Each structure stands twice: as structure tokens, then as C-alpha cells.
Design a protein around this motif. Structure first.
Motif, mmCIF file in Angstrom:
data_model
loop_
_atom_site.group_PDB
_atom_site.id
_atom_site.type_symbol
_atom_site.label_atom_id
_atom_site.label_comp_id
_atom_site.label_asym_id
_atom_site.label_seq_id
_atom_site.Cartn_x
_atom_site.Cartn_y
_atom_site.Cartn_z
ATOM 1 N N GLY A 95 0.824 -1.192 0.000
ATOM 2 C CA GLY A 95 0.000 0.000 0.000
ATOM 3 C C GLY A 95 0.862 1.248 0.000
ATOM 4 O O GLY A 95 2.010 1.205 0.440
ATOM 5 N N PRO A 96 0.311 2.369 -0.489
ATOM 6 C CA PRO A 96 1.054 3.621 -0.670
ATOM 7 C C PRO A 96 1.174 4.474 0.590
ATOM 8 O O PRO A 96 1.870 5.490 0.562
ATOM 9 C CB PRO A 96 0.210 4.364 -1.706
ATOM 10 C CG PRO A 96 -1.183 3.918 -1.419
ATOM 11 C CD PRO A 96 -1.078 2.482 -0.970
ATOM 12 N N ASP A 97 0.515 4.073 1.671
ATOM 13 C CA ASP A 97 0.443 4.909 2.867
ATOM 14 C C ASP A 97 0.985 4.216 4.116
ATOM 15 O O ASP A 97 0.423 4.350 5.203
ATOM 16 C CB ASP A 97 -1.001 5.366 3.101
ATOM 17 C CG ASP A 97 -2.004 4.242 2.937
ATOM 18 O OD1 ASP A 97 -1.609 3.064 3.069
ATOM 19 O OD2 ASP A 97 -3.189 4.536 2.674
ATOM 20 N N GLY A 98 2.079 3.479 3.956
ATOM 21 C CA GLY A 98 2.770 2.884 5.088
ATOM 22 C C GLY A 98 2.107 1.640 5.649
ATOM 23 O O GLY A 98 2.579 1.075 6.636
ATOM 24 N N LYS A 99 1.017 1.207 5.025
ATOM 25 C CA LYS A 99 0.318 0.003 5.460
ATOM 26 C C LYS A 99 -0.260 -0.712 4.247
ATOM 27 O O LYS A 99 -0.518 -0.083 3.221
ATOM 28 C CB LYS A 99 -0.807 0.357 6.433
ATOM 29 C CG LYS A 99 -2.042 0.932 5.757
ATOM 30 C CD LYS A 99 -3.128 1.274 6.760
ATOM 31 C CE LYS A 99 -4.447 1.564 6.064
ATOM 32 N NZ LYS A 99 -4.317 2.607 5.009
#
Length: 416
Positions: free
Chosen positions: A378-382
Motif C-alpha cells: 500500500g502507498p500509505d505505510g500500510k
């Protein structure tokens, strides 16, 4: 003598499920055909009677029967936008690329009329985006002509993947799946079988974690082995012949380093490949199967079903393992943590992953130009999606295969 053949044709058309069964019970030919080659399955698909389609198929109906104009039941289902029937036909062995007299495939029909959901399902089963009708038009061209930008985009994405594989002489399959809902966002040949190679080791870790949750195993239990246990590529286990390794260390070695001996040692505790397959059946995965141990499982013999999965099955099972109820939250986290610490998949998705993105993965390599990867990213650290990509049969170099997978990843990342 009552002509049961025609009576069955009419019953199938009218949606008389009971009458269909009665006629068949009394000896009606499930593959009866009229003077145009129309069969009960054609008419059921044309009318949109799902239950009758199923009954016919489970009792010997020819799924790929063609009429005089080259129409199969799959053609008719796609033309009339009967999604569920398209799915059932394909699951029962329909030819996804059957061409009618005009050179039209089911994908042409779905693209032309703008049936996006059907386009997607056809792609799951390997529909040929390069197929040309008698006018030289591909499904993409028909989508453009009729102003179906939705379908055009999906077909274009599929073409990029297929065309790259064709250049290498490879068969390719992939899927992008939503972690939470399990919704399929994109795919190609996701219902076809590929060799798992070392990607199976994340499933093995799941089986061990299940035993840990049950109290049958302990992460801190030390396993002692000998030199005769060592197989090819055992970078971690070859260092601990005199002191042994804990179950935790073995699971870590198997996932983060793809240590083969580590995997075999863990396999032994669950009864081997048959044990892992049994665990998969408990997960609700009746497709994936492990039959051999390391390193024989990497042979990747063409059309061999041993040691194979499908992208959709692997992605679905991985989702269940990371988010499901079968593993405890602590175990689900441990599995994710091990995959996040993978250090042998550098040349694949990680080679095109922008800064800030989260990735937990496991790669695989095998004979006959086999390569693959499973990942939650995922692009947001998760992680928010599951991606599975397999390629096989090219006999290409490792570098070429690495870039094949990397570029598919790059496409998904850009079109996230």
C-alpha cells in the motif's frame, strides 16, 4: 415414442427446472441438438436460466458445443450479459476464446456492448485480447468504436501484461485484490494454475502459526537436525548444525531467506506436503496443493498440477491468513512481520516501489523460467491490497524474468 430431445430443448428455454430433470431422468439426451446445432445448454444460456445451466453441466452437457453459426453457450451468455452464467460456463471448462463464423470471441461481444463485469471475468480465464475478428478488430478496437472507455482501459492493461509475456514465450498470470473486502480490482489468467515455487512458504508459516495458536507447537521450541537434512540453498540452516534452531528462527529463515531446509523441517512437523494441503482445505482453499518437498517442488513441469495454485486462490488464502479469523491477531501480525522482512525479493516489486510504500512479500523461482511473487502492499505505510504474479515456461534468464514481474508491478503502482 415421445421425442424427449426436443421436449428438453423447450423446457430449457422456458426455465422449467423440474421438467428438465424429469426428462433427463427418463433418458433425454442432455446433448440433444436441433437442425441448427442448438442444444439445451445454448437455450438455457440464451434465456438466462442459471439453475438449468448448472443441472445440464453436472450431468454431461458439452460446454463447448457449437451451432451452425459458430455460437457456443458462452457466446450467447456474453451477448445477453448473463454474468453468473458466463462464470459457471468458464468454471466448467468452456473455451474462453471460441470464435464464431464472424471471428468474434466472447470478449469481442462483451467489449462491444460494454459489459465490463463480463470483460473482467473473461480476462480471469485468459481471454485473448489480441484476438481479431474477420475485420481485423480486437475487443479493444470494438470498445473504442462503441465508446466504452471503461472496457478499453481494462483491456489495454491486460494487453500490456500479455504482450510482454508473449515476447518471452511465457505464460503469465496475476491478480490485484482488496485486502479488506476481497474484491478483485484487476487480473489476467488468475483462474489458471501456476507453480507456486517458494511462495508456498507463506502458507507453510500459516500452518505452523495455526498449530501455535492451538498449543500444538511453540515458537521457542528448539529443533535439532543434522547434515543429512541439508538440501540445496540453505544459507541459514547450514550455520546451526550443532546448536539447532527454534521454530521461530526456522519460520523466519523460510520466509525472509527462502531457506529450503528450514521449510522441509517445518513441513515434517505437520506431516509433509499432504499436511500442508490438509491445512489449506481447512482454510477453504480446495485449489492450492503441495505434493513434493524442497527442492523437487520447483520442477515446474508444463501442465503438471503438482505443487500449483491459481493467482486468485493464493491471493484469497493469503488474505484469509493476514486478516481472517483463523489465525489469532498476534499470529496474523507475525506472518506480516516475517514477510515485511523478506530480503531475497529485491529485484522484483521492491525494485519499482516508491519511497513511503509498505510491502510484505515472498518470492519464488523455479525451473523452466519460472518466477513469482505474492505481496501485501500500500502507498500509505500500510497494506491495503494483495498482489500475486506468476510467470512460467519461457526458459528466459533470471534478469529478464525479474524485469517482467517488476514492470507489471510498476503498472499496478502507477494505476493504483
Amino acid at each position: 415414442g415421445s421425442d424427449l430431445g426436443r421436449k428438453l430443448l423447450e423446457a430449457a428455454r422456458a426455465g422449467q427446472d423440474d421438467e428438465v430433470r424429469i426428462l433427463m431422468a427418463n433418458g433425454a439426451d442432455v446433448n440433444a441438438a436441433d437442425n441448427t446445432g442448438t442444444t439445451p445448454l445454448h437455450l438455457a444460456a440464451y434465456s438466462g436460466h442459471l439453475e438449468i445451466v448448472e443441472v445440464l453441466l453436472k450431468h454431461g452437457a458439452d460446454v463447448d458445443a457449437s451451432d451452425v453459426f459458430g455460437y457456443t453457450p458462452l457466446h450467447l451468455a456474453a451477448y445477453w450479459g448473463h454474468l453468473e452464467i458466463v462464470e459457471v460456463l468458464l468454471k466448467n471448462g468452456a473455451d474462453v476464446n471460441a470464435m464464431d463464423s464472424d471471428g468474434m470471441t466472447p470478449l469481442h461481444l462483451a467489449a462491444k456492448w460494454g459489459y465490463l463485469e463480463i470483460v473482467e471475468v473473461l480476462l480471469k480465464h485468459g481471454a485473448d485480447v489480441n484476438a481479431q475478428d474477420k475485420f481485423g478488430k480486437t475487443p479493444f478496437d470494438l470498445a473504442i468504436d462503441n465508446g466504452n472507455e471503461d472496457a478499453a482501459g481494462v483491456l489495454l492493461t491486460a494487453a500490456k501484461v500479455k504482450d510482454a509475456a508473449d515476447q518471452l514465450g511465457a505464460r503469465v498470470g496475476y491478480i490485484e485484490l482488496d485486502l479488506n473486502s476481497g474484491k478483485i480490482l484487476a487480473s489476467f489468467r488468475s483462474e489458471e494454475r501456476f507453480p507456486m515455487m517458494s511462495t508456498f512458504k507463506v502458507l507453510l508459516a500459516g500452518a505452523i502459526l495455526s498449530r501455535i495458536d492451538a498449543g500444538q507447537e511453540q515458537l521457542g521450541r528448539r529443533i535439532h537436525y543434522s547434515q543429512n537434512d541439508l538440501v540445496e540453498y540453505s544459507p541459514v540452516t547450514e550455520k546451526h548444525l550443532t546448536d539447532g534452531m527454534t521454530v521461530r528462527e526456522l519460520a523466519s529463515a523460510a520466509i525472509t531467506m527462502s531457506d529450503n531446509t528450514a521449510a522441509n523441517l517445518l513441513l515434517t512437523t505437520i506431516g509433509g506436503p499432504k499436511g500442508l494441503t490438509a491445512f489449506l482445505h481447512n482454510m477453504g482453499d480446495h485449489v492450492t496443493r503441495l505434493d513434493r518437498w524442497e527442492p523437487e517442488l520447483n520442477e515446474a513441469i508444463p501442465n503438471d498440477e503438482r505443487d500449483t495454485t491459481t493467482p486468485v486462490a493464493m491471493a484469497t488464502t493469503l488474505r484469509k491468513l493476514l486478516t481472517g479469523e483463523l489465525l489469532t491477531p498476534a499470529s496474523r501480525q507475525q506472518l506480516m512481520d516475517w514477510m515485511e522482512a523478506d530480503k531475497v525479493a529485491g529485484p522484483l516489486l521492491r525494485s519499482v516501489l516508491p519511497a513511503g510504500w509498505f510491502i510484505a512479500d515472498k518470492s519464488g523461482a523455479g525451473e523452466r523460467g519460472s518466477r513469482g511473487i505474492v505481496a501485501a502492499l500500500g502507498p500509505d505505510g500500510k497494506p491495503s491490497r494483495i498482489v500475486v504474479i506468476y510467470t512460467t515456461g519461457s526458459q528466459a534468464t533470471m534478469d529478464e524474468l525479474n524485469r517482467q514481474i517488476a514492470e507489471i508491478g510498476a503498472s499496478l503502482i502507477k494505476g493504483w
